[PDB]
């Protein structure tokens, strides 16, 4: 045998070095996210490519990896401060990326301005929410060919009450035209306009994320039974809703950024 046993039983040097060099850089769910990207930035390519952050195939877990090897992991449930049995609608890879990008920003802000632990955990969300680089990425994805800084467009009343009810799922069962389109993305391929709703998970992350490890979960998780509901219903009747929407897009110079007498809450973020 000889050096099979030499070769095999050998401990894995490269592993525990990289694997807990990491713990050094420690001396938190979002904190890691940030750290890890921060770390990844100090490298320069041929090297940067060997750092990856990616959901497990099951979207239950965010994994960190140097070279091939998982270095550290994170449960989404816990990352969003929500319970074990909570269901998450799947994300397309672009949605996954934004998601990840937003967590970094939460990271920065946590580790950069610890003094937002002052009254309002909201003023952390509001920080993230207010940040133009997020705003950009959200628009880039969800309304790819819209200038978020455009002047609003003013309403042109086309709506019946059967209609208004079909659009209630867009805003938690309410109707209100200054605000009815704020979770709605749209793209223009080949002179068609296609619509879809901001992925609940992201909506949650932009709107109701609360850092607390005290116990707000089941409560902060009923909110994922407002967002997944809105989302699902929309989906469940997508063809009809989009017809209406399509009508409205075209009549207001190709937006849903609809203002009504100085009120305009129809932005994405």
Coordinates of N, CA and C in Angstrom, one line a residue, residues 23-267:
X23 N -12.9 32.0 9.4 CA -13.3 32.4 10.8 C -12.5 33.6 11.3
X24 N -11.2 33.6 10.8 CA -10.4 34.8 11.1 C -11.1 36.1 10.7
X25 N -11.4 36.2 9.4 CA -12.0 37.4 8.9 C -13.3 37.7 9.6
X26 N -14.0 36.7 10.2 CA -15.1 36.9 11.1 C -14.7 37.8 12.3
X27 N -13.7 37.4 13.1 CA -13.1 38.2 14.2 C -12.4 39.5 13.8
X28 N -25.9 38.2 11.9 CA -24.6 37.9 11.1 C -24.9 37.3 9.7
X29 N -26.2 36.9 9.5 CA -26.6 36.3 8.2 C -26.2 37.2 7.1
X30 N -26.6 38.5 7.2 CA -26.2 39.5 6.2 C -24.7 39.8 6.4
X31 N -24.3 40.0 7.6 CA -22.9 40.3 7.9 C -22.0 39.4 7.1
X32 N -22.2 38.1 7.1 CA -21.4 37.2 6.3 C -21.5 37.6 4.9
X33 N -22.7 37.7 4.3 CA -22.9 38.0 2.9 C -21.9 39.1 2.5
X34 N -21.9 40.2 3.3 CA -21.1 41.4 3.0 C -19.6 41.0 3.1
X35 N -19.2 40.6 4.3 CA -17.8 40.1 4.5 C -17.4 39.4 3.2
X36 N -18.1 38.3 3.0 CA -17.7 37.4 1.9 C -17.5 38.1 0.6
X37 N -18.3 39.1 0.3 CA -18.1 39.8 -1.0 C -17.0 40.8 -0.9
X38 N -16.8 41.3 0.3 CA -15.8 42.3 0.6 C -14.5 41.5 0.3
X39 N -14.3 40.4 1.0 CA -13.2 39.5 0.8 C -13.0 39.2 -0.7
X40 N -14.0 38.8 -1.4 CA -13.9 38.4 -2.8 C -13.4 39.6 -3.6
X41 N -13.7 40.8 -3.2 CA -13.2 42.0 -3.9 C -11.7 42.2 -3.8
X42 N -11.1 41.8 -2.6 CA -9.6 41.9 -2.5 C -8.9 40.7 -3.0
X43 N -8.7 40.7 -4.3 CA -8.2 39.5 -5.0 C -7.7 39.7 -6.4
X44 N -8.6 40.3 -7.2 CA -8.3 40.6 -8.6 C -8.4 39.3 -9.4
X45 N -9.1 39.3 -10.5 CA -9.4 38.1 -11.3 C -8.2 37.1 -11.6
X46 N -8.6 35.9 -12.1 CA -7.9 34.7 -12.0 C -8.0 34.2 -10.6
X47 N -8.3 35.1 -9.6 CA -8.5 34.8 -8.2 C -10.0 35.0 -7.9
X48 N -10.5 36.2 -8.2 CA -12.0 36.5 -7.9 C -13.0 35.5 -8.3
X49 N -12.7 34.9 -9.5 CA -13.5 33.8 -10.0 C -13.6 32.6 -9.1
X50 N -12.7 32.5 -8.2 CA -12.7 31.3 -7.3 C -13.4 31.5 -6.0
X51 N -14.2 32.6 -5.9 CA -15.1 32.9 -4.8 C -16.5 32.9 -5.3
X52 N -17.4 32.0 -4.8 CA -18.8 32.0 -5.2 C -19.8 32.0 -4.1
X53 N -20.9 32.7 -4.3 CA -22.0 32.7 -3.3 C -23.2 32.4 -4.2
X54 N -23.9 31.3 -3.8 CA -25.0 30.7 -4.6 C -25.9 30.0 -3.8
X55 N -27.2 30.1 -4.1 CA -28.2 29.3 -3.4 C -27.9 27.8 -3.7
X56 N -28.2 26.9 -2.7 CA -28.2 25.5 -3.0 C -29.3 25.3 -4.0
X57 N -29.2 24.2 -4.7 CA -30.2 23.8 -5.8 C -31.6 24.0 -5.3
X58 N -31.8 23.9 -4.0 CA -33.1 23.9 -3.4 C -33.6 25.2 -2.9
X59 N -32.8 26.3 -3.1 CA -33.1 27.6 -2.6 C -33.4 27.7 -1.1
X60 N -33.0 26.7 -0.4 CA -33.2 26.8 1.1 C -32.0 27.5 1.7
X61 N -30.9 27.4 1.1 CA -29.6 27.8 1.6 C -28.7 28.6 0.7
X62 N -28.1 29.6 1.3 CA -27.0 30.4 0.6 C -25.7 29.7 1.0
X63 N -24.9 29.4 0.1 CA -23.6 28.8 0.3 C -22.5 29.7 -0.1
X64 N -21.4 29.7 0.7 CA -20.2 30.4 0.3 C -19.1 29.4 -0.1
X65 N -18.3 29.6 -1.1 CA -17.4 28.6 -1.6 C -16.1 29.2 -2.1
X66 N -14.9 28.8 -1.5 CA -13.6 29.0 -2.1 C -13.2 27.8 -2.9
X67 N -12.7 28.0 -4.1 CA -12.5 27.0 -5.1 C -13.8 26.2 -5.2
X68 N -13.8 24.9 -5.1 CA -15.0 24.1 -5.2 C -15.8 24.1 -3.9
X69 N -15.1 24.4 -2.8 CA -15.5 23.9 -1.5 C -16.3 24.8 -0.7
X70 N -17.4 24.3 -0.1 CA -18.2 25.1 0.7 C -17.4 25.5 1.9
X71 N -17.5 26.7 2.3 CA -16.8 27.3 3.4 C -17.6 27.7 4.6
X72 N -18.9 28.0 4.3 CA -19.9 28.5 5.2 C -21.2 28.5 4.5
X73 N -22.3 28.5 5.2 CA -23.7 28.4 4.6 C -24.6 29.3 5.3
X74 N -25.8 29.5 4.8 CA -26.8 30.2 5.5 C -28.3 29.9 5.1
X75 N -29.1 29.6 6.1 CA -30.5 29.3 5.8 C -31.2 30.5 5.5
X76 N -32.0 30.5 4.5 CA -32.8 31.5 4.0 C -33.8 31.9 5.1
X77 N -34.5 30.8 5.6 CA -35.5 31.0 6.7 C -35.0 32.0 7.8
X78 N -33.8 31.6 8.3 CA -33.2 32.3 9.4 C -32.6 33.6 8.8
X79 N -32.2 33.6 7.6 CA -31.6 34.9 7.0 C -32.7 36.0 6.9
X80 N -33.9 35.6 6.6 CA -35.0 36.5 6.6 C -35.7 36.7 7.9
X81 N -35.3 35.8 8.9 CA -35.9 35.9 10.2 C -37.4 35.4 10.2
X82 N -37.5 34.2 9.7 CA -38.8 33.6 9.4 C -38.7 32.1 9.8
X83 N -39.8 31.4 9.9 CA -39.7 30.1 10.5 C -39.4 28.9 9.5
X84 N -39.0 27.8 10.2 CA -38.5 26.6 9.5 C -39.5 26.1 8.4
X85 N -40.8 26.1 8.7 CA -41.7 25.5 7.8 C -42.2 26.5 6.7
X86 N -41.7 27.7 6.7 CA -42.1 28.7 5.7 C -41.8 28.4 4.3
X87 N -42.8 28.5 3.4 CA -42.6 28.2 2.0 C -42.1 29.4 1.2
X88 N -41.2 29.2 0.3 CA -40.6 30.2 -0.5 C -40.9 29.8 -2.0
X89 N -41.5 30.8 -2.7 CA -41.7 30.6 -4.1 C -40.3 30.7 -4.8
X90 N -40.0 29.9 -5.8 CA -38.7 29.8 -6.4 C -38.4 31.1 -7.2
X91 N -37.1 31.4 -7.3 CA -36.7 32.6 -8.1 C -35.9 32.2 -9.3
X92 N -36.1 32.9 -10.4 CA -35.2 32.8 -11.6 C -33.9 33.4 -11.2
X93 N -32.9 33.1 -11.9 CA -31.5 33.4 -11.5 C -31.2 34.8 -11.3
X94 N -31.9 35.6 -12.2 CA -31.7 37.1 -12.1 C -32.3 37.5 -10.7
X95 N -33.4 37.0 -10.3 CA -34.1 37.3 -9.0 C -33.1 36.9 -7.9
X96 N -32.5 35.8 -8.0 CA -31.5 35.3 -7.1 C -30.4 36.3 -7.0
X97 N -29.9 36.9 -8.1 CA -28.8 37.8 -8.1 C -29.1 39.1 -7.4
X98 N -30.2 39.7 -7.7 CA -30.6 40.9 -7.0 C -30.7 40.7 -5.5
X99 N -31.5 39.7 -5.2 CA -31.6 39.2 -3.8 C -30.2 39.3 -3.2
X100 N -29.3 38.6 -3.8 CA -28.0 38.6 -3.2 C -27.4 39.9 -3.1
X101 N -27.5 40.7 -4.2 CA -27.0 42.1 -4.1 C -27.7 42.9 -3.1
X102 N -28.9 42.7 -2.8 CA -29.5 43.5 -1.7 C -29.0 43.2 -0.4
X103 N -28.6 41.9 -0.2 CA -28.2 41.5 1.1 C -26.8 42.1 1.4
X104 N -26.0 42.2 0.4 CA -24.7 42.9 0.6 C -25.0 44.3 1.1
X105 N -25.8 45.0 0.4 CA -26.2 46.4 0.9 C -26.6 46.4 2.3
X106 N -27.4 45.4 2.7 CA -27.8 45.4 4.1 C -26.6 45.2 5.0
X107 N -25.7 44.3 4.5 CA -24.4 44.0 5.2 C -23.6 45.3 5.4
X108 N -23.2 46.0 4.3 CA -22.6 47.3 4.4 C -23.2 48.1 5.5
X109 N -24.4 48.4 5.3 CA -25.1 49.4 6.2 C -25.0 48.9 7.6
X110 N -25.2 47.6 7.9 CA -25.1 47.1 9.3 C -23.7 47.3 9.8
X111 N -22.7 46.9 9.1 CA -21.3 46.9 9.6 C -20.7 48.3 9.4
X112 N -21.3 49.2 8.7 CA -20.8 50.5 8.4 C -21.4 51.6 9.3
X113 N -22.7 51.5 9.5 CA -23.4 52.4 10.4 C -24.1 51.6 11.5
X114 N -23.4 51.1 12.4 CA -24.0 50.4 13.5 C -25.1 51.2 14.3
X115 N -25.0 52.5 14.2 CA -25.9 53.4 14.9 C -27.3 53.6 14.2
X116 N -27.7 52.6 13.3 CA -29.1 52.6 12.9 C -29.9 51.6 13.7
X117 N -29.2 51.0 14.7 CA -29.9 50.3 15.8 C -30.6 51.2 16.8
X118 N -30.4 52.5 16.6 CA -31.3 53.6 17.2 C -32.7 53.2 16.7
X119 N -33.7 53.8 17.5 CA -35.1 53.6 17.1 C -35.3 53.5 15.6
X120 N -36.2 52.5 15.3 CA -36.5 52.1 13.9 C -35.4 51.1 13.4
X121 N -35.8 49.9 13.3 CA -35.1 48.9 12.5 C -35.4 49.3 11.0
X122 N -36.5 50.0 10.8 CA -36.9 50.6 9.5 C -35.9 51.5 8.9
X123 N -35.1 52.2 9.7 CA -34.2 53.2 9.2 C -32.9 52.4 8.6
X124 N -32.8 51.1 8.8 CA -31.9 50.3 8.1 C -32.5 49.9 6.7
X125 N -33.7 49.4 6.7 CA -34.5 49.1 5.5 C -34.6 50.4 4.7
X126 N -34.9 51.5 5.3 CA -35.0 52.7 4.6 C -33.7 53.1 4.0
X127 N -32.6 52.9 4.7 CA -31.3 53.1 4.2 C -31.1 52.3 2.9
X128 N -31.2 51.0 3.0 CA -31.1 50.1 1.8 C -32.1 50.6 0.7
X129 N -33.4 50.8 1.1 CA -34.4 51.2 0.2 C -34.0 52.5 -0.5
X130 N -33.4 53.4 0.2 CA -33.1 54.7 -0.3 C -31.9 54.7 -1.2
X131 N -31.0 53.7 -1.1 CA -29.8 53.7 -1.8 C -29.9 53.5 -3.3
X132 N -29.5 54.5 -4.1 CA -29.6 54.6 -5.5 C -29.0 53.4 -6.3
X133 N -28.0 52.7 -5.7 CA -27.5 51.6 -6.4 C -28.5 50.4 -6.3
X134 N -29.2 50.3 -5.2 CA -30.3 49.3 -5.2 C -31.3 49.7 -6.2
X135 N -31.9 50.9 -6.0 CA -32.9 51.4 -6.9 C -32.6 51.0 -8.3
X136 N -31.4 51.2 -8.7 CA -31.0 51.0 -10.1 C -31.1 49.6 -10.4
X137 N -30.6 48.7 -9.6 CA -30.6 47.3 -9.9 C -32.0 46.7 -10.0
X138 N -32.9 47.2 -9.1 CA -34.2 46.8 -9.1 C -34.9 47.2 -10.3
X139 N -34.8 48.4 -10.7 CA -35.4 48.9 -12.0 C -34.7 48.1 -13.2
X140 N -33.4 48.0 -13.1 CA -32.8 47.4 -14.2 C -33.4 46.0 -14.5
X141 N -33.7 45.3 -13.4 CA -34.3 44.0 -13.6 C -35.7 44.1 -13.9
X142 N -36.5 44.7 -13.0 CA -37.9 44.7 -13.1 C -38.6 45.6 -14.2
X143 N -38.0 46.7 -14.5 CA -38.5 47.6 -15.5 C -37.3 48.1 -16.3
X144 N -36.8 47.2 -17.1 CA -35.5 47.3 -17.7 C -35.3 48.5 -18.7
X145 N -36.4 49.0 -19.2 CA -36.3 50.1 -20.2 C -37.1 51.3 -19.7
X146 N -37.1 51.6 -18.4 CA -37.7 52.8 -17.8 C -36.7 53.6 -17.1
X147 N -36.7 54.9 -17.3 CA -36.0 55.8 -16.4 C -36.8 56.0 -15.2
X148 N -36.2 55.6 -14.0 CA -36.9 55.7 -12.8 C -37.1 57.2 -12.4
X149 N -36.3 58.0 -13.0 CA -36.3 59.5 -12.7 C -37.3 60.3 -13.6
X150 N -37.9 59.6 -14.5 CA -38.9 60.3 -15.4 C -40.0 61.0 -14.6
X151 N -40.6 62.0 -15.3 CA -41.8 62.6 -14.7 C -42.9 61.7 -14.8
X152 N -43.8 61.6 -13.8 CA -44.9 60.7 -13.9 C -45.8 61.1 -15.0
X153 N -46.8 60.2 -15.2 CA -47.8 60.4 -16.2 C -49.1 60.4 -15.5
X154 N -50.1 61.2 -16.0 CA -51.4 61.4 -15.3 C -52.5 60.5 -15.9
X155 N -53.3 60.0 -15.0 CA -54.3 59.0 -15.2 C -55.4 59.3 -16.3
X156 N -56.0 58.3 -16.9 CA -56.9 58.4 -18.0 C -58.1 57.5 -17.8
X157 N -58.7 57.5 -16.6 CA -59.8 56.6 -16.2 C -60.5 55.7 -17.2
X158 N -59.9 54.4 -17.3 CA -60.5 53.5 -18.3 C -61.3 52.3 -17.6
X159 N -61.5 52.4 -16.2 CA -61.7 51.2 -15.4 C -63.1 51.0 -14.9
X160 N -63.6 49.8 -15.1 CA -64.9 49.4 -14.6 C -64.7 48.9 -13.1
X161 N -65.7 48.4 -12.5 CA -65.6 47.9 -11.1 C -65.4 46.4 -11.1
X162 N -65.8 45.7 -12.1 CA -65.4 44.4 -12.3 C -63.9 44.4 -12.4
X163 N -63.4 45.3 -13.3 CA -62.0 45.5 -13.5 C -61.3 45.8 -12.2
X164 N -61.6 46.8 -11.5 CA -61.0 47.2 -10.3 C -60.7 46.0 -9.3
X165 N -61.7 45.1 -9.3 CA -61.6 43.9 -8.5 C -60.6 42.9 -9.0
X166 N -60.4 42.9 -10.3 CA -59.4 42.0 -10.8 C -58.0 42.5 -10.5
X167 N -57.8 43.8 -10.3 CA -56.6 44.3 -9.9 C -56.4 44.4 -8.4
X168 N -57.3 43.9 -7.6 CA -57.1 44.0 -6.1 C -55.9 43.3 -5.6
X169 N -55.6 42.1 -6.2 CA -54.5 41.3 -5.8 C -53.2 42.0 -5.9
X170 N -53.1 43.0 -6.8 CA -51.9 43.8 -6.9 C -51.5 44.6 -5.7
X171 N -52.5 44.9 -4.8 CA -52.2 45.8 -3.7 C -53.0 45.4 -2.4
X172 N -52.8 44.1 -2.1 CA -53.3 43.5 -0.8 C -54.9 43.6 -0.7
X173 N -55.6 43.5 -1.8 CA -57.0 43.6 -1.8 C -57.6 44.9 -1.9
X174 N -56.7 46.0 -1.8 CA -57.1 47.4 -2.0 C -57.2 47.7 -3.5
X175 N -57.9 48.8 -3.8 CA -57.6 49.5 -5.1 C -57.3 50.9 -4.8
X176 N -56.3 51.4 -5.6 CA -55.9 52.8 -5.5 C -54.9 53.1 -6.6
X177 N -55.3 53.9 -7.5 CA -54.5 54.0 -8.8 C -53.2 54.7 -8.6
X178 N -53.0 55.5 -7.6 CA -51.7 56.1 -7.4 C -50.6 55.0 -7.0
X179 N -51.1 53.9 -6.5 CA -50.3 52.8 -5.9 C -50.5 51.4 -6.4
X180 N -51.4 51.2 -7.4 CA -51.8 49.9 -7.8 C -50.7 49.1 -8.6
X181 N -49.6 49.8 -9.0 CA -48.7 49.2 -9.9 C -47.3 49.0 -9.4
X182 N -47.1 49.1 -8.1 CA -45.8 49.3 -7.5 C -45.0 48.0 -7.4
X183 N -45.7 46.9 -7.5 CA -45.0 45.6 -7.6 C -45.1 45.0 -9.0
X184 N -45.3 45.9 -10.0 CA -45.4 45.4 -11.3 C -44.2 45.8 -12.2
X185 N -43.6 44.7 -12.7 CA -42.5 44.9 -13.7 C -43.1 44.8 -15.1
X186 N -42.3 45.3 -16.1 CA -42.7 45.1 -17.5 C -41.5 45.2 -18.4
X187 N -41.5 44.4 -19.5 CA -40.5 44.5 -20.5 C -41.1 44.5 -21.9
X188 N -40.3 45.2 -22.8 CA -40.7 45.3 -24.2 C -39.8 44.6 -25.1
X189 N -40.3 43.4 -25.5 CA -39.6 42.6 -26.5 C -40.5 42.8 -27.8
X190 N -39.8 43.0 -28.9 CA -40.5 42.9 -30.2 C -41.9 43.6 -30.2
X191 N -42.1 44.7 -29.6 CA -43.3 45.5 -29.7 C -44.5 44.9 -28.9
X192 N -44.2 43.9 -28.1 CA -45.1 43.4 -27.1 C -44.7 43.9 -25.8
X193 N -45.6 44.1 -24.8 CA -45.2 44.5 -23.5 C -45.6 43.3 -22.6
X194 N -44.7 42.9 -21.8 CA -44.9 41.8 -20.9 C -44.8 42.2 -19.5
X195 N -45.6 41.7 -18.6 CA -45.7 42.2 -17.3 C -45.4 41.0 -16.4
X196 N -45.0 41.3 -15.1 CA -45.0 40.3 -14.1 C -44.8 41.1 -12.8
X197 N -44.9 40.4 -11.7 CA -44.9 41.0 -10.4 C -43.6 40.7 -9.7
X198 N -43.1 41.7 -8.9 CA -41.9 41.6 -8.2 C -42.0 40.4 -7.4
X199 N -40.9 39.6 -7.3 CA -40.9 38.3 -6.7 C -41.1 38.6 -5.2
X200 N -42.2 38.0 -4.6 CA -42.5 38.2 -3.2 C -41.3 38.2 -2.3
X201 N -40.4 37.2 -2.4 CA -39.3 37.2 -1.6 C -38.6 38.5 -1.6
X202 N -38.4 39.1 -2.8 CA -37.7 40.4 -2.9 C -38.6 41.5 -2.3
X203 N -39.8 41.4 -2.6 CA -40.7 42.4 -2.0 C -40.5 42.4 -0.5
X204 N -40.5 41.2 0.1 CA -40.3 41.0 1.5 C -39.0 41.7 2.0
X205 N -38.0 41.5 1.2 CA -36.7 41.9 1.6 C -36.5 43.4 1.4
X206 N -37.3 44.0 0.6 CA -37.2 45.4 0.4 C -38.1 46.1 1.3
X207 N -39.1 45.4 1.9 CA -40.2 46.1 2.5 C -40.4 45.7 4.0
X208 N -40.2 44.5 4.3 CA -40.5 44.0 5.7 C -39.4 43.2 6.3
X209 N -38.1 43.5 6.0 CA -37.1 42.8 6.6 C -36.7 43.5 8.0
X210 N -36.7 42.6 9.0 CA -36.4 43.1 10.3 C -35.2 42.3 11.0
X211 N -34.1 42.9 11.3 CA -33.0 42.3 12.0 C -33.4 42.1 13.5
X212 N -33.4 40.8 13.9 CA -33.8 40.4 15.3 C -33.6 38.9 15.5
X213 N -32.6 38.6 16.4 CA -32.3 37.2 16.7 C -32.5 36.9 18.1
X214 N -37.1 40.1 19.7 CA -36.2 38.9 19.6 C -36.9 37.9 18.7
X215 N -38.1 37.5 19.0 CA -38.8 36.5 18.3 C -40.0 37.1 17.7
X216 N -39.9 37.5 16.4 CA -40.9 38.2 15.7 C -41.4 37.3 14.6
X217 N -40.9 36.1 14.5 CA -41.1 35.2 13.3 C -42.5 35.0 12.9
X218 N -43.2 34.0 13.5 CA -44.6 33.6 13.0 C -45.4 34.8 12.6
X219 N -45.1 35.9 13.3 CA -45.7 37.2 13.0 C -45.2 37.8 11.7
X220 N -43.9 38.0 11.6 CA -43.2 38.5 10.4 C -43.4 37.5 9.2
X221 N -44.0 36.4 9.5 CA -44.2 35.3 8.5 C -45.6 35.2 8.0
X222 N -46.5 35.8 8.8 CA -47.9 35.9 8.2 C -47.7 36.8 7.0
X223 N -46.8 37.8 7.1 CA -46.6 38.7 5.9 C -46.2 37.9 4.7
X224 N -45.4 36.8 4.8 CA -45.3 36.0 3.6 C -46.5 35.2 3.3
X225 N -47.7 35.4 4.0 CA -49.0 34.9 3.6 C -50.0 36.1 3.2
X226 N -49.3 37.2 2.9 CA -49.9 38.3 2.2 C -49.2 38.4 0.8
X227 N -47.9 38.1 0.8 CA -47.1 38.4 -0.4 C -47.2 37.2 -1.4
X228 N -47.0 36.0 -0.9 CA -47.2 34.8 -1.6 C -48.6 34.7 -2.2
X229 N -49.6 35.2 -1.4 CA -51.0 35.2 -1.8 C -51.2 36.2 -2.9
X230 N -50.9 37.4 -2.7 CA -50.9 38.4 -3.8 C -50.3 37.8 -5.1
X231 N -49.0 37.4 -4.9 CA -48.3 36.8 -6.0 C -49.1 35.7 -6.7
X232 N -49.4 34.7 -5.9 CA -50.1 33.5 -6.5 C -51.4 33.9 -7.2
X233 N -52.3 34.7 -6.5 CA -53.5 35.2 -7.2 C -53.2 35.8 -8.5
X234 N -52.4 36.8 -8.5 CA -51.9 37.5 -9.7 C -51.6 36.4 -10.7
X235 N -50.7 35.5 -10.4 CA -50.4 34.4 -11.3 C -51.7 33.6 -11.7
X236 N -52.5 33.3 -10.7 CA -53.7 32.5 -11.0 C -54.6 33.1 -12.0
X237 N -54.5 34.4 -12.1 CA -55.4 35.1 -13.1 C -54.6 36.1 -13.9
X238 N -53.4 35.7 -14.4 CA -52.4 36.6 -15.0 C -52.9 37.1 -16.4
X239 N -53.5 36.2 -17.1 CA -53.9 36.6 -18.5 C -54.8 37.8 -18.5
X240 N -55.8 37.7 -17.7 CA -56.8 38.7 -17.7 C -56.2 40.0 -17.1
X241 N -55.4 39.9 -16.1 CA -54.9 41.2 -15.5 C -54.0 41.9 -16.4
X242 N -53.2 41.1 -17.1 CA -52.2 41.7 -18.0 C -52.9 42.4 -19.2
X243 N -54.0 41.9 -19.6 CA -54.8 42.5 -20.6 C -55.2 43.9 -20.2
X244 N -55.6 44.1 -19.0 CA -56.0 45.3 -18.4 C -54.8 46.2 -18.3
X245 N -53.8 45.7 -17.7 CA -52.6 46.4 -17.6 C -52.1 46.9 -18.9
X246 N -52.1 46.0 -19.9 CA -51.6 46.3 -21.2 C -52.3 47.5 -21.8
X247 N -53.6 47.5 -21.7 CA -54.5 48.6 -22.0 C -53.8 49.9 -21.3
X248 N -53.6 49.8 -20.0 CA -53.1 51.0 -19.3 C -51.7 51.5 -19.6
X249 N -50.8 50.5 -19.9 CA -49.5 50.9 -20.3 C -49.5 51.8 -21.5
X250 N -50.3 51.4 -22.5 CA -50.2 52.0 -23.8 C -50.8 53.3 -23.8
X251 N -51.8 53.5 -23.0 CA -52.5 54.8 -23.0 C -51.8 55.9 -22.2
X252 N -50.8 55.5 -21.4 CA -50.1 56.5 -20.6 C -48.6 56.5 -21.0
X253 N -48.4 56.6 -22.3 CA -47.1 56.7 -22.9 C -46.1 55.6 -22.4
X254 N -46.6 54.4 -22.4 CA -45.8 53.2 -22.1 C -45.1 53.3 -20.7
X255 N -46.0 53.4 -19.7 CA -45.6 53.3 -18.3 C -46.8 52.7 -17.5
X256 N -46.5 52.2 -16.3 CA -47.5 52.2 -15.3 C -47.2 53.2 -14.1
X257 N -46.2 54.0 -14.4 CA -45.8 55.1 -13.4 C -46.9 56.1 -13.4
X258 N -48.0 55.8 -12.8 CA -49.3 56.6 -12.9 C -49.5 57.5 -11.7
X259 N -49.6 58.8 -11.9 CA -49.9 59.8 -10.9 C -51.3 60.3 -11.0
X260 N -51.9 60.7 -9.9 CA -53.2 61.2 -9.9 C -53.3 62.5 -9.0
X261 N -53.3 63.7 -9.6 CA -53.4 64.9 -8.9 C -52.3 65.0 -7.8
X262 N -51.0 65.0 -8.1 CA -49.9 65.2 -7.2 C -49.5 63.9 -6.5
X263 N -50.4 62.9 -6.3 CA -50.0 61.7 -5.7 C -49.5 60.7 -6.8
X264 N -48.4 60.0 -6.5 CA -47.8 59.0 -7.3 C -46.9 58.1 -6.6
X265 N -47.4 57.0 -6.2 CA -46.7 56.0 -5.4 C -46.4 54.8 -6.3
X266 N -46.5 54.9 -7.6 CA -46.5 53.7 -8.5 C -45.1 53.2 -8.9
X267 N -44.0 53.9 -8.5 CA -42.6 53.4 -8.4 C -42.4 52.0 -7.9

